[PDB]
Amino acid sequence: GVSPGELRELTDEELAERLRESKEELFNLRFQMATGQLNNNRRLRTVRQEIARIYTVLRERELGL
RNA sequence: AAGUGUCUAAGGGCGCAUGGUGGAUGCCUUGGCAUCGAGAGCCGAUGAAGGACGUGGGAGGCUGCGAUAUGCCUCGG
Ligand SMILES: [Mg+2]
Ligand SMILES: [Mg+2]
Ligand SMILES: [Mg+2]
């Protein structure tokens, strides 16, 4: 997935857009898993973890980075 | 003629032989019991103890966790 090291340079708005597009990817992966066209089922966990990473970066930024 | 004279088993008893059931005995153990030697002696409105519901690629329970959900970041091993 995406590294915290390569996430700690995006400012606030690139972070907010990465978050939104990652959520969109997770939505699409959920529908593909439901309809049976997903092969690599390890993608769900990866996308969830990168979303959690983006929240972690934003929260630590707004509380004394 | 008179007399003597067995055998058999519908079933049963006792003894063997050969099986079945059952789980005693023997020997164990990821479990307990009683202490001894050091700790630490409180937790909570900054929301506790304890829970309900959720959370995994596949059903449920335990266990971990909380919509960031068997996990996120950093520092060590
Ligand atoms: Mg007889
Ligand atoms: Mg007979
Ligand atoms: Mg390390």
Residue entry with tokens 């969109």: A24
Strands (E), chain A: none
CA–CA gap between residue A51 and residue A45 (Å, rounded): 10
∠ CA A9-A13-A63, rounded to 5°: 70
Span from the CA of A52 to the centroid of ligand 2 (angstroms): 86
**A2, A34 contact by CB (below 8 A):** no
**CA A7 → C1' B19, Å?**
79
* SS3 assignment for A10-30: CCCHHHHHHHHHHHHHHHHHH
Name the experiment that determined this structure: cryo-EM
CA–CA gap between residue A58 and residue A8 (Å, rounded): 9
Q: What is the resolution of this structure in A?
A: 2.7
CA–CA gap between residue A27 and residue A24 (Å, rounded): 5
CA–CA gap between residue A35 and residue A50 (Å, rounded): 24
**CA A46 → C1' B29, Å?**
44
**CA A42 → C1' B68, Å?**
18
At A56, is the secondary structure helix, strand, or coil? helix
**A50, A1 contact by CB (below 8 A):** yes
Span from the CA of A9 to the centroid of ligand 1 (angstroms): 106
At A54, is the secondary structure helix, strand, or coil? helix
